[PDB]
């Protein structure tokens, strides 16, 4: 359970708090895990299309 | 039930379908005769499931009715919080 919630400890540690950009949830520009252009085949419960 | 009269499949068929123990679907068929078919199937759907809901009435003599199920109004909620019975008990009333 909590080392992929220590993976919560391992995809918001090694970057960054101080400066962000252009209004999409967060700091969204992002990259390939965390912003506002990944919804999907996601066809289970409810949030993303 | 009467008169329609009895599902032999055939494509009549009749919406309920008020049986228990359809040792009937097969049974024989054997096979379906010369009609168009498509629904057909619907008639078996709705009324077979009715044949389920009305097949009950009972089994409620040992339930254990339904519950508040959750935390939500529950039109008072202002003098006690709400919590739901997830039914780990063996619901029998013995």
């Amino acid at each position: 359970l909590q080392h992929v919630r220590a993976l919560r400890q391992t995809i918001t540690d090694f970057t960054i708090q101080g400066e962000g950009h252009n209004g999409e949830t967060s700091e969204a520009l992002n990259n390939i895990l965390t912003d506002d252009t990944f919804i999907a085949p996601i066809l289970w419960d409810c949030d993303a299309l | 039930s009467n008169p329609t009269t009895f599902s032999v499949e055939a494509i009549a068929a009749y919406t309920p379908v008020a049986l228990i123990r359809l040792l009937n679907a097969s049974g024989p068929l054997q096979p379906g005769h010369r009609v168009d078919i498509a629904d057909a199937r619907s008639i078996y759907t709705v009324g077979a499931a009715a044949s389920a809901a009305r097949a009950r009435a009972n089994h409620n003599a040992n339930t254990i009715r339904r519950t508040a199920m959750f935390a939500e109004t529950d039109p008072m909620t202002w003098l006690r919080p709400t919590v739901g019975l997830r039914r780990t008990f063996n619901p029998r009333i013995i």
Binding site: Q17, G18, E19, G20 | -
Partner: protein
């Protein structure tokens, strides 16, 4: 009742932050901090303050 105060704090703090405070930048390696970049560098003078 310690609840309305928290709500008020949340509402005020939603826009209290037009930029980001310089005091969670505890992360930089020695050299990132050291380079004459860092705006907090000119405020790190006495090791006991």
């Amino acid at each position: 009742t310690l609840d309305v105060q928290m709500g008020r704090f949340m509402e005020t703090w939603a826009d209290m932050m037009p930029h980001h405070p310089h005091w969670v930048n505890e992360h930089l390696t020695i050299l990132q901090f050291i380079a004459p970049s860092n705006p907090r560098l000119r405020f790190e003078l006495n090791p006991a303050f």
